[PDB]
Motif scaffolding. Structure first.
Motif, PDB file in Angstrom:
ATOM      1  N   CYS F 233       0.833  -1.201   0.000  1.00 33.83           N
ATOM      2  CA  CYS F 233       0.000   0.000   0.000  1.00 33.83           C
ATOM      3  C   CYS F 233       0.864   1.245   0.000  1.00 33.83           C
ATOM      4  N   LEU F 235      -0.170   4.460  -0.197  1.00 39.44           N
ATOM      5  CA  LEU F 235      -0.797   5.694   0.240  1.00 39.44           C
ATOM      6  C   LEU F 235       0.034   6.521   1.239  1.00 39.44           C
ATOM      7  N   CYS F 236       1.205   6.026   1.640  1.00 38.62           N
ATOM      8  CA  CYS F 236       2.078   6.716   2.609  1.00 38.62           C
ATOM      9  C   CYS F 236       3.434   5.994   2.743  1.00 38.62           C
ATOM     10  N   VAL F 238       4.971   4.098   5.108  1.00 37.99           N
ATOM     11  CA  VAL F 238       5.088   2.798   5.791  1.00 37.99           C
ATOM     12  C   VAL F 238       5.053   1.586   4.852  1.00 37.99           C
ATOM     13  N   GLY F 239       4.175   1.606   3.856  1.00 43.07           N
ATOM     14  CA  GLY F 239       4.172   0.563   2.843  1.00 43.07           C
ATOM     15  C   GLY F 239       3.779  -0.812   3.359  1.00 43.07           C
ATOM     16  N   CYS F 240       2.569  -0.887   3.899  1.00 42.53           N
ATOM     17  CA  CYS F 240       2.070  -2.107   4.500  1.00 42.53           C
ATOM     18  C   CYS F 240       1.731  -3.135   3.427  1.00 42.53           C
ATOM     19  N   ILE F 267      -3.793  -2.986   9.042  1.00 40.45           N
ATOM     20  CA  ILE F 267      -3.931  -2.004   7.986  1.00 40.45           C
ATOM     21  C   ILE F 267      -4.582  -0.744   8.613  1.00 40.45           C
ATOM     22  N   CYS F 268      -4.394   0.450   8.029  1.00 41.95           N
ATOM     23  CA  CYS F 268      -5.123   1.633   8.523  1.00 41.95           C
ATOM     24  C   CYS F 268      -6.330   1.856   7.639  1.00 41.95           C
ATOM     25  N   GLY F 271      -5.874   3.176   4.336  1.00 44.01           N
ATOM     26  CA  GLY F 271      -5.229   2.067   3.653  1.00 44.01           C
ATOM     27  C   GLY F 271      -6.185   1.008   3.114  1.00 44.01           C
ATOM     28  N   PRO F 384       0.464   6.188   9.866  1.00 44.38           N
ATOM     29  CA  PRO F 384      -0.549   5.647  10.777  1.00 44.38           C
ATOM     30  C   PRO F 384      -0.144   4.367  11.540  1.00 44.38           C
ATOM     31  N   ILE F 385       0.419   3.402  10.834  1.00 44.75           N
ATOM     32  CA  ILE F 385       0.833   2.159  11.482  1.00 44.75           C
ATOM     33  C   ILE F 385       1.849   2.382  12.608  1.00 44.75           C
TER      34      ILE F 385
HETATM   35  S1  SF4 Z   1      -0.459   3.182   7.252  1.00 44.42           S
HETATM   36 FE1  SF4 Z   1      -2.380   3.046   6.003  1.00 44.42          FE
HETATM   37  S2  SF4 Z   1      -1.996   4.306   4.130  1.00 44.42           S
HETATM   38 FE2  SF4 Z   1       0.048   3.880   5.111  1.00 44.42          FE
HETATM   39  S3  SF4 Z   1       0.859   2.096   3.902  1.00 44.42           S
HETATM   40 FE3  SF4 Z   1      -0.267   1.397   5.820  1.00 44.42          FE
HETATM   41  S4  SF4 Z   1      -2.436   0.897   5.205  1.00 44.42           S
HETATM   42 FE4  SF4 Z   1      -1.408   2.185   3.560  1.00 44.42          FE
END
Ligand code: SF4
Ligand code: SF4
Ligand code: SF4
Ligand code: SF4
Ligand code: SF4
Ligand code: SF4
Ligand code: FES
Lengths: 145, 154, 196, 377, 127, 754
Positions: F233, F235-236, F238-240, F267-268, F271, F384-385
């Motif tokens: 992911c 969107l930021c 961290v890359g979950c 996950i956030c 996310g 977020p994570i």
């Molecule tokens: S913290 Fe949220 S937006 Fe960021 S990589 Fe993880 S799931 Fe995606």
């Protein structure tokens, strides 16, 4: 000329003509081969009927059989394996005989009852008369060439 | 003998039909269990949430899209077998040949119980203004085709 | 009883003996001793050679000696002279890098078509076969279908409005080495058997 | 001078003169590839894939497979299912044979006898439609037992046909026995030395047609054939004349299995009520949570047989038949090797017609009774 | 007995009061669940009057302040139940011959039902 | 280690191990409902019962294997008739009051309860088998009820594990779900209606049945029908690891993919529930301008029209601007295209004034192992994570041991309702940040003031009391870690002092960069040159855009090529050649983590239309500029990266960089970094990804702004309507704008139109 009452009213006569001089030339493969030899037993050729799973090895053969035919000509496909790849979705089977030859009519069944294959040719029959349309509303071309 | 109707046994495997209850609700609850048991991957199902005011089935789930590829279909009755509701039951029609590959993918509206004729039959009987004539006769209808009015004079 | 004389012999000679409670039994011969030892088997009274089945073990959950293996079915027809009806399977694992395994063509004539199918579908070569030619798979086909890492070659099935299905992404059915749709599998869905 | 003659089988008959030097057959033309595509389906789902190889005596594939599995996870076939499975099996034997016989009645010019062979078969097939709703590929055999019970009309109708067959089969034996032309046609041709058939594995029930007493229902009894009054026909010297006859005799012994099994038919269950192996009764799906969970689970991802390998040999209208199933503890079979009777049967065709004439070489294959579905699969 | 049929008859009416009070005091009436012995009844016969087994009177948030249910046709000790979710109060209405719907000894009339639903609405409903 | 013998198999295993883990570790199995990876274990469902021998001296009663420790020389039987009879019974007690929805229930074939019933239940006693014993009225309650626009609750199906309520308390720390009554009458419910936390979608993947389900994806397909595409992911920073579920080109549902090194199994919400927009409205063909408007054109007609606008261009007037989530390959080509084609201005959508590459990357692992946590920024919103690794770090939890089956099922180390340590961290933020709760040393400053707080921490000024207690804490800190995001990394002053403090003390950093592939694009040399033209500074004359820039950088330029995925209004009016591009969900290649880890992107079978990745579009616009590019496709591009020597998947790539280009701050407005991104305001994420305006109740009402009014607002980044909020923690006379893009942590001008 080509689009004139005269010409047209000939080619509608000719079509209705060989709409009844259709000479089926069956092309049995597996199980479907035997279920057709029950409709042949109940009653140079145009109209090859493909009846069974068409192998990939077997394909180039049915190719020549088809090419070396007269010209006003039609193909009927018998049951699931000819129509689609059937239940047999894999390396060894052609997934629609239309990959290799222009299919005029398709008949569902595995295998199709004998009496359904009768209906199948009454279809291709009424199609070379040029009296057949698809579900969209379009008139369908008598031969697929 | 396209002149005399062929008698098939009441158990025969013909064109699938979806059934309704007496209430008129459709038996189908778009669970997609029938599709899941199909050895030929020939059933596609999109579910939908019933409308409390205007219901389609009994639960909170009915079948938005219900599609069977009649070319892919082998006609096991595995689907009729896996069904929990008695929804999809193979019927009697067999006169269903056609010209364009994608025309043979029947839809929910081709299979509801009320429907009388196969896709090509009804279509032709459309541009002709002549009623549908089925080519079969059966001793009686299975109990499982409760509703499916067909030629049963026997 | 011609079978006990095989078993009494493999026991002394360090051959593993495989047995399932269902009615079949094996005896796994090494690579070298296979050739001759099998010839000895026919001389022992072993008339008919039923099948020869090729096995690819690549995606098998438990580990085995080498990747490929071939199984033979030797019998003594009960309809002949002094036939017992003693039948059994003999197995030979075969290295992944060396698909070599002698023919039984000298001994049984069944091994003709049967060994070419095991060569066509699995990549296994037979030293001294009259002619190792493809049997069932089209002439130009490259590779060996029946072995695990060769694609089933499926096609998506098609429906009305961009609605397709990919079987490889649709199958609910698990496959031995697959952990499943929840976190793990145990219990009766790790393998189940009734107790008659 | 090499001619290229090629049912959906192709033959490279090398031949200078009028004899026959060596026939080199080429198959692979109906190669559907069942053995691979079956590593990718449920155990229940494979029951649709078995009938499609020997599509003639198809029920034997159904049974051969169901057998190896039932053993594998240990299922108990109810008495009523065991019974219906032999009636059904042999009723399918006659279908295959009637065909082999029929194809013979034409090489021989007998025409009204053939137009009858076809009518018999059609009456056998309607019976299938009566209980299974199909002419063939009936999805009727199950791992537990059978899909459902049989209809009321089935017994009375099986009685009609089981009534006119008795002497019917004899009539066919007669036309071929009192062989007007047939004698001069088949008697000498197609030499099958007893001890070479046992080398090439020509199990084909045209094995006993050359003096070998090996029918698997006798040597390795299975579905309760173990307990039937059973005559295994034999032939004197392995020619085509005897092969044709052997198969006609096999028709009576079938018809007798049928009558015998038909007696011991009492009402009861039809498949093993084990919840792990068999989906719950239909009616309580509206009551038991367990049923629903079981039912749902059953029909999506199948059941899981234990890690192990199995083989049970059965007898078809074409010889030894049996599935070699490697289970890996999954919802689907890890390997499925099918013993094609018709595949090994054909290695005995180069020898079969060597040095012989040529137009004879038709009947010299028809007598080996091959079905391409079986050989190629 | 045949009470079972008259009890189901009474299930319809309780539902009737629910729909009434609902439109009346303008509060969501929500069909909560159907009888699985209808959904999964196949070719099998079905003579019950409705197909609704769990009903409710929910508020604006959808959180219910009144829950109602009757037991299926195949279950034992059939009762019809009323529960005030969150307030720990359960009721069990049976059916007596001649008397009618009772919570033991006290008749369960429209009026008495309306009383409970009101008490519940004012007290429990979040929005 | 300790010696245990499961059934017939003996195993090594560290002291603290749960018998449940030791059991699975030998390759066995056992019913398992209430326990979950990464949660406090409690024996509540009573499913994992074993028999335990410990001298052979069988203990008299059966043990909950999930909350029983392992002793030296212990035997564990999981197959006895005593065990199995008990199991089948416990499966029966569960299914007792359950509803009968399996066909209709969306929890399909992925339902632990279903799988465990068919596995261990219906016990074989040694004809007609009995399926159900209970023949009474099952439990009837509230059904199909949404808790939030993302989560729908079936209470009838709940099996009373504690998976959910436990999690809320333990992992994010937001007790917004609990049981209610008691007995057979108890149920899950809420009083905090919205479902407050931004980590509420996780309960969706844990709930062992279909009580708590993802509403974003209600009634789409049965679980097996979904094709599953594992990716990352973007969107930021961290890359979950995630899983993208798709059927027939459209995006159905997002779930979490376990990847313990980074995010574990969490996950956030942004996310996971902001996928509405990537399958909904999209540009499917290449557009080109004809008569003051754009019209449909083939890739053919558009390659020429692109040769036109650029034939009249010198190679130094060229701009190369990528989006924040560009791939590690898309940034390398762009670096080379711009190298050969000598240009000074090539940049990326999120680039920070002070490079994140300044600092030595710290592994999330390190964070758990660290002693003190110095934080400036809001982890909740930036990365977020990190909220969730700090929840573990605060509780003193440390990296578990790894068994044969991976992460433990029953970590005895996690106690339920653990105490939280307020002495372990310090938070500094422009507002009352979330995790400021779990921090003693906390102080609310005003925007871009960190520059001064940071000076203080070094030891050259005087900060408030908190900032002194904080200096002293990092002082006594043995192996602390620095986390910082917006203002620190956007403001050369602070960021320079930042890197200094953490240089003196040998400590690593977590840069919560506003650009997702930030640390990696920088690693590729996608940083502007001497000239200056940055992603927001209208500089060059002919340029490529991988996004929608500030209106201020477009207006003027001679040729513009926007390589978007959707069609912005600012493009259909200032653009010359627009090209369909794929989302990160349907891309392929690698990224680099805020911790320096290189993660893989795999391509989902979504509806791309006629779209081509920027790797291709770039190669195509390099031709129309002269030099033939060195990159064509992914296979070959892979060699170029492997050339620069960037480690394989999961490996960390070390790369420092000393250089910084500052820029001034027009402090009127603040772009408050938020979790939700602005292009996610579709459908259900519609209301949650709306913008917001925060000001102190005096200044708020001073500038005519009621507590709940829909205000229009204008910035250098565009005109956005926005809900207005009073907050006593917002610094007086400033306004906080929801920076729903990669332009967060910025100070800018603008005003409220009326
Ligand atoms: S913290 Fe949220 S937006 Fe960021 S990589 Fe993880 S799931 Fe995606
Ligand atoms: S469609 Fe069915 S009956 Fe026909 S060849 Fe294929 S498997 Fe045989
Ligand atoms: S009859 Fe069989 S092949 Fe046809 S749709 Fe049903 S399950 Fe599929
Ligand atoms: S026909 Fe039956 S199995 Fe198929 S979706 Fe409908 S209820 Fe489910
Ligand atoms: S939660 Fe599981 S057991 Fe309950 S209805 Fe859903 S799938 Fe069935
Ligand atoms: S809602 Fe789900 S996770 Fe929560 S207690 Fe109930 S069953 Fe467990
Ligand atoms: S008690 Fe629920 S898993 Fe141990």
């Amino acid at each position: 000329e080509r689009e004139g009452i005269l010409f047209t009213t000939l080619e509608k006569l000719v079509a209705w003509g060989r709409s009844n001089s259709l000479w089926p030339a069956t092309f049995g493969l597996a199980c479907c081969a035997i279920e057709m030899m029950a409709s042949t037993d109940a009653r140079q050729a145009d109209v090859m009927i493909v009846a069974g799973r068409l192998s990939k090895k077997m394909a180039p053969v049915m190719r020549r059989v088809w090419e070396q035919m007269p010209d006003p000509k039609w193909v009927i496909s018998m049951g699931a394996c000819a129509s689609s790849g059937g239940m047999f979705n894999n390396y060894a089977i052609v997934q629609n005989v239309d990959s290799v030859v222009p299919v005029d009519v398709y008949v569902p069944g595995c295998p199709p009852r004998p009496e359904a294959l009768i209906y199948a040719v009454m279809q291709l029959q009424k199609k070379v008369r040029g009296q057949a349309y698809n579900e969209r509303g379009e008139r369908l071309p008598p031969v697929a060439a | 003998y396209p002149d005399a109707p062929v008698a098939l046994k009441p158990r025969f495997h013909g064109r699938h039909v979806l059934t309704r209850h007496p209430n008129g609700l459709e038996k189908c609850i778009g669970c997609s269990l029938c599709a899941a048991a199909c050895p030929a991957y020939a059933i596609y199902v999109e579910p939908a949430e019933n409308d409390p005011e205007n219901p389609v089935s009994a639960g909170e789930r009915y079948a938005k899209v219900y599609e069977i590829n009649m070319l892919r279909c082998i006609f096991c009755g595995l689907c009729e077998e896996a069904c929990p509701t008695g929804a999809i039951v193979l019927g009697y029609d067999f006169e269903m040949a056609d010209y364009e590959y994608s025309d043979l993918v029947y839809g929910k509206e081709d299979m509801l119980v009320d429907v009388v004729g196969t896709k090509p039959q009804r279509r032709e009987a459309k541009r002709t203004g002549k009623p549908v004539k089925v080519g079969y006769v059966v001793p009686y209808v299975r109990p499982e085709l409760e509703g499916f009015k067909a030629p049963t004079e026997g | 009883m011609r079978l006990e004389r095989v078993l009494e012999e493999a026991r002394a000679k360090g051959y593993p003996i495989e047995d399932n409670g269902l009615g079949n039994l094996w005896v796994v011969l090494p690579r070298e001793r296979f050739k001759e030892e099998m010839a000895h088997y026919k001389a022992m009274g072993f008339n008919f050679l039923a099948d020869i089945v090729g096995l690819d073990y690549l995606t098998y959950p438990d580990p085995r000696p080498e990747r490929f293996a071939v199984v033979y079915e030797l019998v003594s027809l009960p309809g002949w002279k002094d036939g017992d009806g003693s039948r059994f399977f003999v197995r030979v694992y075969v290295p992944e890098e060396d698909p070599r395994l002698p023919t039984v063509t000298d001994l049984w004539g069944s091994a003709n078509f049967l060994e070419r199918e095991v060569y066509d579908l699995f990549g296994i070569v037979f030293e001294g076969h009259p002619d190792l030619r493809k049997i069932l798979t089209p002439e130009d086909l490259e590779g060996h279908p029946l072995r695990k890492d060769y694609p089933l070659g499926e096609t998506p099935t098609l429906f009305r409005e961009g609605r397709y299905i990919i079987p490889a992404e649709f199958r609910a059915a698990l496959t031995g080495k697959d952990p499943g749709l929840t976190f793990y599998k145990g219990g009766s869905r790790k393998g189940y058997r009734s107790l008659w | 001078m090499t001619l290229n003659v090629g049912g959906v089988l192709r033959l490279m008959v090398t031949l200078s003169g009028e004899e026959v030097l060596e026939v080199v057959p080429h198959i692979g033309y109906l190669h559907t590839g069942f053995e691979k595509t079956m590593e990718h389906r449920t155990y229940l789902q494979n029951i649709t894939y078995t009938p499609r190889m020997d599509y003639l005596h198809s029920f034997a594939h159904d049974l051969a497979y169901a057998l190896a599995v039932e053993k594998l996870l240990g299922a108990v076939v109810p008495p009523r299912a065991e019974t219906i499975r032999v009636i059904l099996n042999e009723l399918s034997r006659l279908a295959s044979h009637l065909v082999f016989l029929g194809t013979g009645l034409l090489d021989l010019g007998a025409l009204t006898p053939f137009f009858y062979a076809f009518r018999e078969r059609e009456t056998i097939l309607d019976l299938f439609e009566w209980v299974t709703g199909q002419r063939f590929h009936h999805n009727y055999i199950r791992i537990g037992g059978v899909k459902e019970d049989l209809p009321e009309e089935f017994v009375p109708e099986l009685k009609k046909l089981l009534e006119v067959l008795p002497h019917r089969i004899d009539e066919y034996e007669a036309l071929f026995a009192e062989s007007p032309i047939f004698y001069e046609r088949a008697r000498g041709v197609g030499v099958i030395p007893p001890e070479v058939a046992i080398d090439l594995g020509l199990t084909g029930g045209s094995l006993r047609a050359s003096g070998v007493n090996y029918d698997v229902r006798k040597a390795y009894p299975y579905s309760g054939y173990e307990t039937y009054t059973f005559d295994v026909p034999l032939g004197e010297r392995g020619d085509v004349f005897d092969r044709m006859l052997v198969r006609i005799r096999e028709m009576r012994e079938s018809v007798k299995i049928i009558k015998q099994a038909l007696e011991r038919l009492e009402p009861g269950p039809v498949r093993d009520p084990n919840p792990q192996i068999t989906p719950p009764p239909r009616h309580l799906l509206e009551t038991s949570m367990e049923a629903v969970i079981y039912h749902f689970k059953h029909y999506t991802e199948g059941f899981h047989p234990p890690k192990g390998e199995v083989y049970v040999p059965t007898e078809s209208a074409r010889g030894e038949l049996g599935y070699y199933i490697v289970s890996d503890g999954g919802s689907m079979p890890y390997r499925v090797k099918v013993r094609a009777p018709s595949f090994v049967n054909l290695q005995s065709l180069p020898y079969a017609c060597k040095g012989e004439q040529v137009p004879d070489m038709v009947a010299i294959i028809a007598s080996l009774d091959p079905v391409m579905g079986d050989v190629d699969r | 007995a045949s009470s079972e049929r008259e009890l189901y008859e009474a299930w319809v009416e309780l539902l009737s009061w629910m729909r009434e009070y609902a439109q009346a005091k303008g509060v969501r009436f929500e069909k909560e669940a159907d009888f699985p012995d209808f959904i999964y009844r196949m070719e099998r016969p079905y003579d019950l009057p409705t197909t609704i087994m769990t009903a409710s009177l929910s508020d604006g948030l959808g959180e219910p302040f009144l829950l109602a249910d009757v037991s299926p046709r195949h279950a034992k000790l059939k009762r019809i139940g009323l529960r005030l979710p969150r307030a720990h109060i359960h009721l069990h209405a049976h059916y007596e011959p001649g008397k009618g719907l009772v919570t033991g000894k006290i008749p369960l009339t429209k009026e008495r039902f309306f009383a409970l639903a009101d008490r519940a609405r004012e007290a429990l409903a979040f929005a | 280690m300790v010696r245990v013998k499961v059934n017939d198999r003996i195993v090594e295993v560290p002291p603290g191990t749960s018998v449940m883990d030791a059991v699975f570790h030998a390759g066995y199995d056992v019913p398992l409902f209430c326990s979950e990876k990464h949660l406090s274990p409690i024996g509540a469902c009573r499913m994992c019962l074993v028999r335990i021998g410990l001298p052979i001296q069988w203990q008299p009663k059966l043990a909950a294997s999930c909350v029983t420790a392992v002793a030296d020389g212990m035997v564990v039987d999981t197959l006895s008739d005593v065990v199995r009879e008990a199991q089948a019974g416990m499966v029966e007690f569960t299914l007792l009051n359950h509803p009968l929805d399996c066909p209709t229930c969306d929890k399909g074939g992925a339902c632990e309860l279903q799988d465990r019933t068919v596995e261990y239940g219906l016990y074989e006693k040694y004809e007609l088998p009995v399926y159900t014993r209970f023949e009474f009225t099952r439990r009837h309650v509230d059904k199909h009820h949404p808790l939030s626009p993302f989560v729908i609750l079936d209470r009838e199906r709940c099996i009373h594990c504690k998976r959910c309520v436990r999690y809320f308390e333990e992992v994010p720390g937001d007790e917004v779900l609990d049981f209610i009554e008691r007995g057979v009458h108890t149920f899950i419910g809420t009083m905090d209606f919205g479902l407050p936390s931004g980590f509420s979608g996780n309960i969706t993947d844990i709930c062992p049945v279909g009580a708590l389900l993802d509403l974003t994806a209600r009634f789409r397909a049965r679980n097996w029908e979904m094709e599953e595409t594992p990716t990352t992911c973007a969107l930021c920073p961290v890359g979950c690891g995630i899983t993208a579920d798709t059927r027939s080109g459209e995006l159905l549902r997002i779930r979490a993919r376990e990847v313990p090194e980074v995010n574990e199994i969490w996950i956030c919400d942004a996310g996971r529930f902001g996928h509405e927009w990537a399958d909904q409205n999209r540009l499917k063909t290449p557009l080109v301008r004809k008569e003051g408007r754009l019209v449909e054109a083939t890739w053919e007609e558009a390659f020429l029209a692109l040769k036109e606008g650029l034939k009249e261009a010198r190679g130094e007037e060229v701009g190369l601007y990528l989006a924040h989530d560009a791939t590690l390959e898309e940034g390398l080509l762009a670096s080379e295209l711009a190298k050969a084609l000598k240009t000074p201005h090539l940049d990326f959508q999120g680039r920070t004034a002070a490079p994140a590459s300044l600092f030595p990357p710290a592994s999330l692992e390190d964070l758990l192992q660290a002693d003190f946590a110095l934080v400036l920024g809001d982890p909740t919103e930036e990365a977020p994570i990190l909220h969730l690794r700090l929840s573990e770090f605060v509780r003193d939890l440390k990296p578990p041991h790894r068994y044969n089956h991976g992460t433990p099922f029953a970590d005895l180390q996690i106690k339920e309702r653990m105490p939280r340590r307020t002495d372990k961290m310090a938070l500094f933020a422009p507002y009352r940040a979330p995790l400021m709760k779990w921090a003693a040393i906390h102080e609310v400053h005003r925007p871009g003031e960190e520059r001064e707080i940071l000076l203080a921490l070094l030891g050259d000024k005087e900060g408030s009391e908190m900032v002194a207690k904080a200096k002293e804490a990092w002082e006594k800190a043995k192996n602390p870690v620095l986390i910082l995001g917006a203002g620190v990394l956007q403001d050369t002053v602070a960021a320079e002092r930042a890197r200094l403090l953490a240089e003196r003390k040998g400590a690593k950093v977590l840069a919560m960069t506003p650009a997702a592939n930030a640390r990696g694009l920088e690693a590729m040399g996608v940083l502007p040159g001497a000239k200056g033209a940055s992603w927001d500074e209208p500089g060059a004359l002919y340029a490529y855009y991988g996004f929608v820039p500030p209106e201020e950088a477009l207006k003027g330029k001679r040729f513009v090529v926007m390589h978007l995925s959707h069609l912005h209004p600012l493009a259909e009016r200032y653009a010359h050649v627009v090209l369909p591009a794929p989302t990160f969900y349907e891309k392929r290649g690698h990224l680099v983590n805020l911790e320096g880890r290189v993660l893989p992107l795999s391509p989902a079978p979504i509806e791309n239309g006629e779209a081509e990745g920027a790797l291709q579009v770039l190669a195509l616009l390099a031709e129309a500029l002269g030099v033939r590019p060195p990159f064509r496709l992914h296979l070959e591009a892979q060699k170029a990266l492997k050339a620069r020597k960037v480690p394989e998947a999961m490996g960390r790539l070390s790369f420092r960089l000393k250089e910084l280009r500052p820029k001034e701050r027009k402090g009127a407005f603040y772009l408050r970094p938020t979790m939700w991104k602005a292009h996610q305001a579709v459908g259900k994420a519609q209301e949650a990804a709306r913008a917001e305006l925060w000001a102190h109740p005096e200044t708020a009402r001073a500038e005519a702004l009621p507590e709940g009014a829909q205000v229009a607002v204008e910035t250098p980044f565009g005109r956005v309507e926005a809900r207005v909020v009073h907050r006593e923690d917002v610094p007086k006379g400033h306004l906080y704008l929801s920076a729903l893009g990669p332009a967060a942590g910025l100070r800018v001008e603008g005003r409220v139109l009326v």
